[PDB]
Design a protein around this ligand. Sequence first.
Ligand SMILES: [Mg+2]
Ligand SMILES: [Mg+2]
Ligand SMILES: [Mg+2]
Ligand SMILES: [Mg+2]
Ligand SMILES: [Mg+2]
Ligand SMILES: [Mg+2]
Ligand SMILES: [Mg+2]
Ligand SMILES: [Mg+2]
Ligand SMILES: [Mg+2]
Ligand SMILES: [Mg+2]
Ligand SMILES: [Mg+2]
Ligand SMILES: [Mg+2]
Ligand SMILES: [Mg+2]
Ligand SMILES: [Mg+2]
Ligand SMILES: [Mg+2]
Ligand SMILES: [Mg+2]
Ligand SMILES: [Mg+2]
Ligand SMILES: [Mg+2]
Ligand SMILES: [Mg+2]
Ligand SMILES: [Mg+2]
Ligand SMILES: [Mg+2]
Ligand SMILES: [Mg+2]
Ligand SMILES: [Mg+2]
Ligand SMILES: [Mg+2]
Ligand SMILES: [Mg+2]
Ligand SMILES: [Mg+2]
Ligand SMILES: [Mg+2]
Ligand SMILES: [Mg+2]
Ligand SMILES: [Mg+2]
Ligand SMILES: [Mg+2]
Ligand SMILES: [Mg+2]
Ligand SMILES: [Mg+2]
Ligand SMILES: [Mg+2]
Ligand SMILES: [Mg+2]
Ligand SMILES: [Mg+2]
Ligand SMILES: [Mg+2]
Ligand SMILES: [Mg+2]
Ligand SMILES: [Mg+2]
Ligand SMILES: [Mg+2]
Ligand SMILES: [Mg+2]
Ligand SMILES: [Mg+2]
Ligand SMILES: [Mg+2]
Ligand SMILES: [Zn+2]
Lengths: 165, 55, 100, 25
Amino acid sequence: FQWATKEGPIFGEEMRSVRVNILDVTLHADAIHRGGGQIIPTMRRATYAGFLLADPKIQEPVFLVEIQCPEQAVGGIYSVLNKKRGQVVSEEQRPGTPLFTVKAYLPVNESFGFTGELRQATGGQAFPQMVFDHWSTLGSDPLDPTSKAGEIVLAARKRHGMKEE
Amino acid sequence: ARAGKVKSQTPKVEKQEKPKQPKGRAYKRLLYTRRFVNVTLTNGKRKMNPSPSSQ
Amino acid sequence: MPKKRASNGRNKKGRGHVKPVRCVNCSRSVPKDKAIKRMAIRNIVEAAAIRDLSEASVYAEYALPKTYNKLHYCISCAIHARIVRVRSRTDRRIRAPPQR
Amino acid sequence: MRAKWRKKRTRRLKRKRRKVRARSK
RNA sequence: GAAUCUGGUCAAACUUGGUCAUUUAGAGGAACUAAAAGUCGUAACAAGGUUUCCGUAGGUGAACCUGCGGAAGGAUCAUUA
RNA sequence: CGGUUUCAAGCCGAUGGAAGUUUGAGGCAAUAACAGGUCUGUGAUGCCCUUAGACGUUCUGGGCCGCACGCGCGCUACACUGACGGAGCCAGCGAGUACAACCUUGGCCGAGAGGUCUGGGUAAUCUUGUGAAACUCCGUCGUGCUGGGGAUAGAGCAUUGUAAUUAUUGCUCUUCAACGAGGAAUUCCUAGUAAGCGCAAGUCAUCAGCUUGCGUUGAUUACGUCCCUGCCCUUUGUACACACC
RNA sequence: ACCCACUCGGCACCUUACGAGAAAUCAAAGUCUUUGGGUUCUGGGGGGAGUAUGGUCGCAAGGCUGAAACUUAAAGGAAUUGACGGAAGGGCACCACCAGGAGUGGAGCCUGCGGCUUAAUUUGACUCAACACGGGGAAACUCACCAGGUCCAGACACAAUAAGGAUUGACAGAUUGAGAGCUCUUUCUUGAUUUUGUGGGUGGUGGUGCAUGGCCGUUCUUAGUUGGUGGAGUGAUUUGUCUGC
RNA sequence: GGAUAGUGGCCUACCAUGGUUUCAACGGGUAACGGGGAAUAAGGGUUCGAUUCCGGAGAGGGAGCCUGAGAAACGGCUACCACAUCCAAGGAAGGCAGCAGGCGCGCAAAUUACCCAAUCCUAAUUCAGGGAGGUAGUGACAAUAAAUAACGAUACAGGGCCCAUUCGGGUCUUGUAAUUGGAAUGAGUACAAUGUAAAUACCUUAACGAGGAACAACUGGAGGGCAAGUCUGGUGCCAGCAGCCG
Ligand SMILES: [Mg+2]
Ligand SMILES: [Mg+2]
Ligand SMILES: [Mg+2]
Ligand SMILES: [Mg+2]
Ligand SMILES: [Mg+2]
Ligand SMILES: [Mg+2]
Ligand SMILES: [Mg+2]
Ligand SMILES: [Mg+2]
Ligand SMILES: [Mg+2]
Ligand SMILES: [Mg+2]
Ligand SMILES: [Mg+2]
Ligand SMILES: [Mg+2]
Ligand SMILES: [Mg+2]
Ligand SMILES: [Mg+2]
Ligand SMILES: [Mg+2]
Ligand SMILES: [Mg+2]
Ligand SMILES: [Mg+2]
Ligand SMILES: [Mg+2]
Ligand SMILES: [Mg+2]
Ligand SMILES: [Mg+2]
Ligand SMILES: [Mg+2]
Ligand SMILES: [Mg+2]
Ligand SMILES: [Mg+2]
Ligand SMILES: [Mg+2]
Ligand SMILES: [Mg+2]
Ligand SMILES: [Mg+2]
Ligand SMILES: [Mg+2]
Ligand SMILES: [Mg+2]
Ligand SMILES: [Mg+2]
Ligand SMILES: [Mg+2]
Ligand SMILES: [Mg+2]
Ligand SMILES: [Mg+2]
Ligand SMILES: [Mg+2]
Ligand SMILES: [Mg+2]
Ligand SMILES: [Mg+2]
Ligand SMILES: [Mg+2]
Ligand SMILES: [Mg+2]
Ligand SMILES: [Mg+2]
Ligand SMILES: [Mg+2]
Ligand SMILES: [Mg+2]
Ligand SMILES: [Mg+2]
Ligand SMILES: [Mg+2]
Ligand SMILES: [Zn+2]
């Protein structure tokens, strides 16, 4: 079980959260003379099919970002987030008027050159300070193309090295 | 698990507050006496670490 | 495998590598030494004649000769039936001609 | 396998090896 | 009695090759070894069901087989006249 | 006693003798084992099962018995050495109830099966001479799937049990199938044995083709050999020793 | 041409070995831990490998010469006892065969076990040594199988209700196969026995006879088994337990 | 003959054809500086020797040379290569395989400390200097020496026993108790004086400095090889140990 959970079929990657069954399981037993080998990857070919036949829409990062913005400027942070699949969780109004924060979920998939997009928008204003938070699910089917998760999957398996699916 | 499963899976018993076995010569003084001077009981042959008499 | 025998092939001692003789049955070339050279002095007529032949015959006393097949056998071929007869380790030292 | 043939085996293996190294002069 | 300077000489090093040694990428090939244990047979060991072997030729799907010669480590220390 | 045999161990033939096959038969039966079989004889049992929706227990109905079809013990026959009637008519092992319901004579009823009254018996006493069968005698049919052979069937009459259809068994009449001595194969057997015949207890409330006992009738043919099969030693070989899977 | 005795040269056996040797054996393989006559050569676990390479030689095949990396705990040798052998002799036994009998296999029918089928047709046992066996001839019981219901037979320990009831019972019809209080309809009984949990057990014809005991079966009722000295061997062992009859 | 301090195929001319070799010439390798020695340790040996002494080499390479008795010096110079410094771009300066330090490499190795007082060395030299050399620091490279309590008493048990009508005193000697009690001790600090170039540390002590909580021994092992667990909980062919067996 520990693999396929560490090394799944669809992605070529781990995780989560898999029941997974089990019923019945016909042995004979024996002595055997059985896996560790036979049962050591019988489960693997099983848990792949249990993964596959369900659905898996696939999960993703997402790094909480909390930026020390000024008020008179830094609307542009919002446009930077709206771009990236981002959800602002909060907009904490500080006692000092020229300081703010914007606690926000941001996928790490989409946060490459994040600061670069932030800097140009804000005009070098507001200081990113992001951190990891929590896994967020996607809506894309993996086998089916033209989907956010599926495109990521096809790219990820090409980075590992096939077979397709 | 498949990586140091047993090391975790045991109940750790704690080091009991038992008295200091003496060091250097006084340690020898035990072992001299616990073989030569005291002389342990023997049914047939001599034995240096006994068992509680059972199967 | 140590020596079964001291002789082995037998005649050959002080004598490089002698000539061989085709066996009788198998036609198995065997040295004329390893050969099991039995002598088959058989009558020209089988015992259960012989009367019958002498009854119908001309003359008296008659030739009544004996054919002289000096046989050979490839040891294996011999064991399968013939004089050989797998002896005991201690008995294998005996060279005495058997019977008699 | 029988040692005479294990000898014969490695005789061919040589004669193949001779054609291989002769293919590059 | 300076720089300067004409031959020599020692000869670094470079240049552009040639050559030995040691290293080291190398597509490919062809091996050999470990093996969870799978196919195909079952060669050898019992006269292992064509006795094994060796040398050496040929052939094969693999063990292997088949000539020739040899050896028993043979399945025989034995047939007398 | 006689031969016979290094005139040993013994074997073979006569005599007598109840007995001359270890007198006949069993009973026990060594070393070492086998991964034989038994966790469904077991409050004999280790540990995995389970432990109240119990895989515990208990009721109630089924099911083990179903049938294209494979083999395996068995029974009945393929008849005239018989079948069917009568008649004659001789055994042995056994077994059997009082707190239950056993064996159950004798008498009446019923073609039967089976009822009923009554007994005798806790048993060399009664059942029981268990007058069992096959047998022996006189008749019917004579070698025709015939009176051989009884299977399949229908209906009833009984009996056990709370309950009988998936006939429990018995009896009644009817049905009359296959099968004219069985191929390849292979089982069992050497004397009161085989083969025939029945009895008998065992299980059983009820069921006998079953079984462990019993007695009746009683041969054929060896009284040897290693041809097959198996086993055993012995010598030999063995790269085997979880031992030719 | 022999006989007989002894002799130089050649080729091999017998017995004891007191000498060697791991032993088989060997009068050389002796005169070697009591280690030294002279000389040449070869070997240093197994494999990888007589391979790779390089020579060198060959018409070539091939030879001579000759590696390591890597790999591995054994590879051997000799013998001992086993087991086994489509090796050879010598036995035994109607579970072998002859000389015969009775048969079975065919026929029908019982009754085992397959196979199929089924809701279940419960399972064990599969050459002798599973297959009319489980004492197993099952109408329910037996009964383990299936369809359905019932019961606690939940020992003891600790706690939550502790009588303003802990819980037990319950005719009537629907309910239910059903004079099962099985319950839902009911509103009367019952008095701390228990019931709800958590430890813990108890039972289980559950599982595994390849975790075991006992009993059995089977090798085999075959004739095998063992030791004590004494010998032979360093030794495992062996001889005793054997040519014959 | 030439050169050299000098001998010489050291170099040059002319001449001769020698020279070495299976008693291994020549070639190659060396994770080779030689020797003294080291470890091992019956005898014979094997392997190691970069390294405290003695030779030899080298100062990034390879050359060439000045001065000088002595240099083919490199804490001299000239150059070329290799590496690199400092720049006002014209040009300058270099050579830790001295000491210390750092990088780098690597499994792998110390402080840019205090001194000439010793040891010696050098000079124009009693007088100066000396990372030669010494002094500490760091230092489990090695090696040497040895604390981790000792003596009581009372309190509970083992051993001798005057005698063993049953005991038991226990007159005599040993072991166990968070009893308790007196008597030391440098591990440390610290006036001092030692020590010392100055200090440290050592040896020596004024003054304090032990009572189980302190002023505390770890490492490995505990089936065999091979000394020693069939103890208590887990674990359950796994995880692991195991030189080998396992
Ligand atoms: Mg051998
Ligand atoms: Mg052999
Ligand atoms: Mg000759
Ligand atoms: Mg010759
Ligand atoms: Mg010049
Ligand atoms: Mg043959
Ligand atoms: Mg074969
Ligand atoms: Mg063969
Ligand atoms: Mg060999
Ligand atoms: Mg008897
Ligand atoms: Mg068994
Ligand atoms: Mg049980
Ligand atoms: Mg049945
Ligand atoms: Mg029977
Ligand atoms: Mg009677
Ligand atoms: Mg008829
Ligand atoms: Mg038998
Ligand atoms: Mg080797
Ligand atoms: Mg029956
Ligand atoms: Mg019945
Ligand atoms: Mg029971
Ligand atoms: Mg003895
Ligand atoms: Mg014996
Ligand atoms: Mg001169
Ligand atoms: Mg060097
Ligand atoms: Mg050296
Ligand atoms: Mg040196
Ligand atoms: Mg060096
Ligand atoms: Mg020096
Ligand atoms: Mg340098
Ligand atoms: Mg220089
Ligand atoms: Mg210098
Ligand atoms: Mg220098
Ligand atoms: Mg330095
Ligand atoms: Mg060091
Ligand atoms: Mg120094
Ligand atoms: Mg220090
Ligand atoms: Mg001290
Ligand atoms: Mg320890
Ligand atoms: Mg331990
Ligand atoms: Mg030990
Ligand atoms: Mg350990
Ligand atoms: Zn022949």
